[PDB]
Amino acid sequence: SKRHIPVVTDIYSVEDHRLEDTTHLQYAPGSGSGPAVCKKVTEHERCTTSIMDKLTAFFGVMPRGTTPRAPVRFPTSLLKIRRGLETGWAYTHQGGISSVDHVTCGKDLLVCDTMGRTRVVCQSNNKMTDESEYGVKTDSGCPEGARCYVFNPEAVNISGTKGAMVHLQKTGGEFTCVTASGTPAFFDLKNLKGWAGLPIFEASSGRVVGRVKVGKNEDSKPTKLMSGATDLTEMVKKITTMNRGEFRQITLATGAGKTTELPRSVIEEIGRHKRVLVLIPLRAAAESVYQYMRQKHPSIAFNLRIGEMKEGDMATGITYASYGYFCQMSQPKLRAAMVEYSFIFLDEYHCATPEQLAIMGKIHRFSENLRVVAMTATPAGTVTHPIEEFIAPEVEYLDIAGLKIPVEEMKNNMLVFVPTRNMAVEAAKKLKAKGYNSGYYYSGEDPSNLRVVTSQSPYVVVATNAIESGVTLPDLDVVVDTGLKCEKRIRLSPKMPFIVTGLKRMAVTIGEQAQRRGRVGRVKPGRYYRSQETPVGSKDYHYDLLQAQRYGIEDGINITKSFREMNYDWSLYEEDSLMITQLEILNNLLISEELPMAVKNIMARTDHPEPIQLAYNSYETQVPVLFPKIRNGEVTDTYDNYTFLNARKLGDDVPPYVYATEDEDLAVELLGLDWPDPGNQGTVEAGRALKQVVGLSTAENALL
Amino acid sequence: LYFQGSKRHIPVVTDIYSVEDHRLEDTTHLQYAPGSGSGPAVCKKVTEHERCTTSIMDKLTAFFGVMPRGTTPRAPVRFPTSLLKIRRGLETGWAYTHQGGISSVDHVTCGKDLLVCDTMGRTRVVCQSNNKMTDESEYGVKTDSGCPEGARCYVFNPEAVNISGTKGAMVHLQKTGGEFTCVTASGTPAFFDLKNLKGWAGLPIFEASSGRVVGRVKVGKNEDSKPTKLMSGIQLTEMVKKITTMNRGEFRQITLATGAGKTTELPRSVIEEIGRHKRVLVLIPLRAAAESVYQYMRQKHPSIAFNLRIGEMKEGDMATGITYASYGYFCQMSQPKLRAAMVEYSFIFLDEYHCATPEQLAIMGKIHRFSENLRVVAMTAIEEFIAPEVMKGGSEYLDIAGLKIPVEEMKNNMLVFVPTRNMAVEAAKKLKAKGYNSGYYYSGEDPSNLRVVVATNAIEVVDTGLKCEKRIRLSPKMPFIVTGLKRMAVTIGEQAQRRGRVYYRSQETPVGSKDYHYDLLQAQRYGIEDGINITKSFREMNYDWSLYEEDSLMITQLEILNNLLISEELPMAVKNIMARTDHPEPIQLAYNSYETQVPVLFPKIRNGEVTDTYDNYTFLNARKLGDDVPPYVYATEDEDLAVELLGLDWPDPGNQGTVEAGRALKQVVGLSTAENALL
């Protein structure tokens, strides 16, 4: 059925005919007459396609003996086309004849006229736009909102005569069906079959502005005639039609302006005085987008919330805020502030910051009152100039972070990704001892100390996978990837201490390796030296979730439970069901009794890296304990003296910790000591619950 | 149509495997992939594999619950000795041919006629017998023979893959008790993941020596150390220790037989173990039940303090003993006040949750919002004749509510359970017209008129097996919610209450779980003031607590609509009207207020036609329907019917809130919200 030759059966010559009222001419579906430069049929010629010609054209073969024909050797007319069993139209214009692709299939028109057996050659065809050109396209543009119409010389109007027109109105890239008065009209699309290919004329000018291609009907919308960046407009439509209690996940390229232009479009669509919130992890990131946006769009108000909480904030523009900003609020205050925003955008959720998981769970508790849109350039479980890919061997040449690299590339700009900061500094000074322009970068460093090193023709910077951003490399040539990183991980066991948190060196993510290779090739081609380390798939957020539990202590909220329910509705993060269950039991223990005031103040004032430790352990021990530091796998006589703890050294008496670190567990093991067992109903029940959860016994009773 | 669940699918036979007996001394190579012996058996060898020619339209029609028109019936004997593969919607099962006809499993066929599009054309095998208690569906008479204990059996799947990797694999069995135990060809106890056995139900089980049928593949069972088995059905001090060792944030479900003291001695034991001055709450649906148990308990255990909370809200209650309360008592509280009150109790006992009253579901979801702060324990608890139904056609028997009862039993005191009240009065006057001492009872009756002398379930033996309860329909066409009374089968527990009274029951089969959708809809009211989505809270609650069976689709739809209900603040006038009216479902006013502020009185329906009478409810300030149908979001079956009979039409959504709500309901069930035709 894709073989059929289109055959012109009727030719309707037409002339411009201005009428101030077209009511009697409209096609059967508040104020206005519908004045237009109508089309009047002056002649109706029937083509004389013979029986065999018709059947041959039906079976895809052009009848033998048809001569070509110029698309100008026609009267200004509308041509009825019958392709196999289907019906459509084409029309004449200065450039020739033009029709629709799904009507003609880009095939030559069979025209058996008074000029004989002829065929019009198809010069252009476009299936995406559904246009077919037998000549050069001459359709002129149309101003937005102008009234148009499409004329069918074979339809029956309200008056019951031959020749009916459907009035239109140009909106966006499509046309809207309206009556002669201008009321939005509805048409059953079956009542419009056989109209494709007809031209759309502007009412005032009587000039072609488009073709009849596709009909579309929405539930509450009137009938439309479609004509087939632009994706962002659809995104904004979907966002703005949201009802309170709905949630959308959006995947946007960073350059497409997920943080910048998307909220701007939304707020311009719903109203400049409506309140829209945009949550960003890093304070500096929120500040940057705030300055950039308020200087770029001076017509739209903006607000930045990264410092003290502004009580009773009702700021009208777009509010760029940090998650941690709202972590300063009690649960009822958080809800009262969140429901006042027309829309809430959760930015860069793929990052698992504790403030982020806490705020996401906490607001999901009242998600029924919110319109929530989560944005990322890279969702959960998503990897992301030409480039040479090298695989460097482990250890003419030189040694860079344990990899064999040829000395030639030391003439070029090199970025070496190394797991730890001690390794970063070590390799840095080892490289400067050999006579190279080396530097180092890790968490907490100033992006300016590197200015001295990067402002030179040859430089070699050794940095952690941490802070890929701040270093801003100029004209970077080669990257050396050790394939390793250093992240915090947690272990959960039914034996107290139930929680053990520590740094671990581990393989890099596949997508994160792609990010390390992403650095070179932006302005100039480059090369990569990669280890034989194989990447591992996914991100672990468990340590960050554990830390996020803190923001629920004052409100008595189980942040782990809130996260589980949130992720159930929103599907934003990969889940380890077992680990989430255990963490939820432990979090239940964490809020089981009011935190002592002394522990509260110590937690608020200390430079301890994981003050939640004090909270978990406070169910067994009131006195924090300083374990001896572990240097090179043995026990030392040094201690991490943190502020406000009023601690004691370990000695030979191991405290009954609920929460410990890998170095504390190691100190206990090396000292030949043992961890105490649970000492109250809370910790005993928590331990037996964790043990029951890790039940290897599976049993099932399924009706096959 | 669209997605409406899984109980509508028509079963369709897709393949027919004609088979013959095939004696083998060794069957090892044929076994299915999971001490001494070869496993000699009368196997089944596939002689023909005919593929059915069910057309696309037939397949989709059967998928949407309708039987394709133009199919002729077919005897279950006009088949080769064969195994029939069945596809009901998306699921797969089996049936088999035998002397008595065709036999299959209930959860595979649902007691529906089999659509069989064979070389014989469009045919149907009629289901003669159906049994949900067992796993039997009969297209004919069951002819399965017995089996001696411990005999070796097997089940053959002509499509499974054996150890040799060919089509047709068998699982060896051995009859133990009323079930079968899985073993290998040698006889070693075997293990099977039940997923590796899904789609095997309906296959026959054969005895090894005789090669004769002894049973069907119905249910799989797996225990920790036990081997895989094939079931033929779906299948105090310790309690107190487990309850009292609970940490805040834990939940326990307890099943206790009545009289063992689910409400009395369990909470009494718990509070006696934890301390007589600790506060324990016990929530009971009925106020009179709570008051009664309060009186009984405070008279029985005078050493323990007791409190009753069924009336006005006692603010800041710190009553030390056991507090018996109605759920509705705590429905008077805002969410923060509810939390403040609930966290002060050491334990909270949810009694008789199987009722699922609106107050019950509302309180359960609302408190589950802060379950992490709570310790929650949910608790739940003459000869039998089957009388035949009577038709339009008797001489020494008599007809009671559509049942054939012998006149002899009329010499005894009879209680007739009847679904509707009109049936109660009708059968009452027919029975007194025949010369009997008859009466009637239903909700609102005088307790003395019956003293002087057929009743609705509201009386809580001749059991019709039916009741009259409100049911709801959810559609993407506004009005999205339609609620009306419907006659329906009784639950198992309620039939047990009707048999509890002194038995002639109809051929009506009971249903396992109560339908709570209407009560959930009504329960949404208790979250309007707090701005809480009771449906969402219920879904999360039941996810954590696993207390009620769930219709995922219905819950999702109800959650979308409930989100619409809380989208904007309720108008003050609507709040006051809802508080003062005798309208039976005031949540209607709240839903409709998103389109219409003026309630509409629809004409009443008497005997299926439109009347000129109206239900004049208080405080509505309504208008008569007339010829102008309001754009209702929430309607009733009689309102929808009145619209249909009057030849009128329901309006479409008229604002972005209702339009988007409709678009969400359509997005569920996979309905296109836009259409794009090439003109």
Author numbering:
A (entry chain A): 1 to 29, 38 to 236, 244 to 399, 405 to 415, 424 to 732
B (entry chain B): -4 to 29, 38 to 238, 247 to 392, 407 to 418, 422 to 481, 490 to 496, 506 to 547, 555 to 731
The authors write:
The cleavages downstream of NS3, NS4A, NS4B and NS5A are catalyzed by the serine protease domain of NS3 which requires NS4A as cofactor for full proteolytic activity and is termed NS3-4A protease. In addition to its protease function, NS3 of HCV and pestiviruses comprises helicase and NTPase activity. Co-immunoprecipitation experiments have shown that NS4A forms a stable complex with NS3 (NS3/4A complex). In view of the critical role of the NS3/4A protein complex in the switch between RNA replication and virion assembly, the determination of the structure of a single-chain CSFV NS3 serine protease-NS4A complex provided the basis for structure-guided functional analyses.
We report here the crystal structure of a single chain construct encompassing full-length pestivirus NS3 in complex with NS4A residues 21–57. To express soluble CSFV NS4A37NS3 for crystallization, we used recombinant constructs encoding full-length NS3 (residues 1 to 683) followed by the 8 N-terminal residues of NS4A; the NS3 sequence is preceeded by residues 21 to 57 of the protease cofactor NS4A. Like in the crystals of the isolated NS3 helicase domain, the two molecules of NS4A37NS3 present in the asymmetric unit (AU) are related by a local 2-fold axis around the helicase domains in which D1 and D3 make a head-to-tail crystallographic dimer interaction. Within a pair, one molecule adopts an elongated conformation (Zmax = 105 Å) similar to what has been observed for different flavivirus NS3 proteins and the other, a more compact conformation (Zmax = 69 Å), similar to HCV NS3 depending on the different orientations of the protease domain relative to the helicase domain. The overall shape of the pestiviral NS4A37NS3 is very similar to its counterparts from the Flavivirus and Hepacivirus genera with two separate globular domains, representing the protease and helicase, linked by a short flexible interdomain region that explains the different relative orientations of the two domains in our structures. The CSFV NS3pro domain, which comprises 192 residues, shares only 3% of sequence identity among the NS3 proteases within the Flaviviridae family. It has the canonical trypsin-like fold containing two β-barrels, with the conserved Asp-His-Ser catalytic triad located in a cleft between them. Like in hepaciviral- and flaviviral proteases, the pestiviral NS3 protease domain seems also to be stabilized by the insertion of a β-sheet from NS4A (residues 21 to 40). Most interestingly, the C-terminal region of the pestivirus NS4A, namely residues 41 to 49, hereafter referred to as "kink region", is interacting with a hydrophobic patch on the surface of NS3pro. Interestingly, residue 132, a methionine in the closely related CSFV (valine in BVDV) and most other pestivirus strains is located on the NS3 protease surface and makes hydrophobic contacts mainly with L45 of the NS4A-kink region.
